[PDB]
């Protein structure tokens, strides 16, 4: 009855998954041993609960990572598949030679996991787009599972490479090669980039030393809020599919933007009484979203907002109307009433009000534009290309991937500029 498996991949995807599982355990009142104090968890002998997630990676370091952190004993060893080498920041080493011999096995651990459910609402993936392991394996797996279960939807909670603050030197190749395939067999590519996460955690919470734990926790909160209106009753309920129907007008404009609310520090926490219009002003601000792309620089094709807690639905709908009507320029004309709302009934742990905003908006083609810029700059000289062409990859697939990327961005531009 509308269950969700949680496939992971790569080190970043694995850390995000561990954080998300422990946050969900916090919301659903579970302890790090799996005892109470069906959509996500599964029942197990002795009243125990085990998450319905698989954990794949080539390097066994992330194994000890998800063991060390709390709530690591919730998972089951049958879902700990792990290689030995680690693609070491090489895309093809997780898509053709070394990654392949794992995906097969992973298929097994999916096929004796999906059929475990009875009415599966779809999958969801958590991985990176630059790291070879995560990107490559997740792309191959998206391929296989879309070949297997085409009827269900597969959200991809992807973290695109940090555009300007790069930590590796082979991001563009991996990102382009992966997006070329993700645009085909994916349905909800919600992009995240550490630039925006540091921006938020600096200029909205004044925190001292932001480690990856805090960014993972924030993305966890957003991930939970995305489907909590499904997990719980509400005055106006939604799901993983109503979002898709109300968010994409064409089978390939499905790349989203994520935003969470509210977020303040103790100083600002003392002030600013909590009320729905303040939440709207916080969610529809530019820099308050998980993507380093000022949304004013594009138009919102469409945008949904899920509220959590108790409120007055008239206030919600009236604020939505006021905000889509006053700033008519930043919104798109040829589609009317392009905003969407939904309301749950159980807010998070001690948070009287919570908003999760998901928006399909043509203001995110700039990210792909600049990533493809870096790519085509590093490809005209065939730089760092032997590492790939030595592993069966040719040099035509790169041109195909870049041309598909440019076709996607051209689609965004073309059907943004359209009129009625």
């Amino acid at each position: 009855m509308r269950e969700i498996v949680h496939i992971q991949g790569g080190q970043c995807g694995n850390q995000i998954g561990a954080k998300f599982w422990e946050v969900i355990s916090d919301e659903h009142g579970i302890d790090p041993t799996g005892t109470y104090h069906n959509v996500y968890y599964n029942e197990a002998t002795g009243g125990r609960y085990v998450p319905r997630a698989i954990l794949m990676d080539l390097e066994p370091g992330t194994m000890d990572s998800v063991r060390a952190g709390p709530f690591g004993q919730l998972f089951r060893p049958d879902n700990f598949v792990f290689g030995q080498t680690g693609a070491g920041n090489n895309w093809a080493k997780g898509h053709y030679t070394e990654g392949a011999e794992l995906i097969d096995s992973v298929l097994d651990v999916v096929r004796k996991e999906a059929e475990g459910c009875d009415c599966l609402q779809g999958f969801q993936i958590t991985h990176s787009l630059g790291g070879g392991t995560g990107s490559g394996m997740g792309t191959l797996l998206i391929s296989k599972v879309r070949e297997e279960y085409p009827d269900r939807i597969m959200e991809t909670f992807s973290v695109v490479p940090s555009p300007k603050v790069s930590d590796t030197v082979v991001e563009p190749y991996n990102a382009t090669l992966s997006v070329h395939q993700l645009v085909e067999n994916a349905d909800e590519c919600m992009v995240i980039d550490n630039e925006a996460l540091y921006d938020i955690c600096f200029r909205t919470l004044k925190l001292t030393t932001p480690t990856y734990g805090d960014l993972n926790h924030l993305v966890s909160a957003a991930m939970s809020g995305v489907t909590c209106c499904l997990r719980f009753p509400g005055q106006l309920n939604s799901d993983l599919r109503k979002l898709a129907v109300n968010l994409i007008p064409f089978p390939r404009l499905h790349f989203f933007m994520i935003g969470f609310a509210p977020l303040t520090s103790r100083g600002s926490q003392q002030y600013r009484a909590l009320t729905v219009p303040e939440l709207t002003q916080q969610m529809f601000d530019a820099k308050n979203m998980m993507c380093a792309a000022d949304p004013r620089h594009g138009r919102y094709l469409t945008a949904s907002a899920l509220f959590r807690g108790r409120m007055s639905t008239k206030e919600v709908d009236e604020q939505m109307l006021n905000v889509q009507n006053k700033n008519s320029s930043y919104f798109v004309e040829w589609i009317p009433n392009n905003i969407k709302s939904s309301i749950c009934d159980i807010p998070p742990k001690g948070l009287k009000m919570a908003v999760t905003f998901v928006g399909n908006s043509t203001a995110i083609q700039e990210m792909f534009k600049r990533v493809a810029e870096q790519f085509t700059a590093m490809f005209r000289r065939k730089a760092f290309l032997h590492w790939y062409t030595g592993e069966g990859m040719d040099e035509m697939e790169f041109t195909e991937a870049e041309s598909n990327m440019n076709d996607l961005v051209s689609e965004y531009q073309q059907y943004q500029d359209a009129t009625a």
């Binding site: 919470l205 925190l207 001292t208 805090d214």
Partner: peptide, 4 residues
């Protein structure tokens, strides 16, 4: 919260 557990900010710090």
């Amino acid at each position: 919260n557990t900010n710090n």
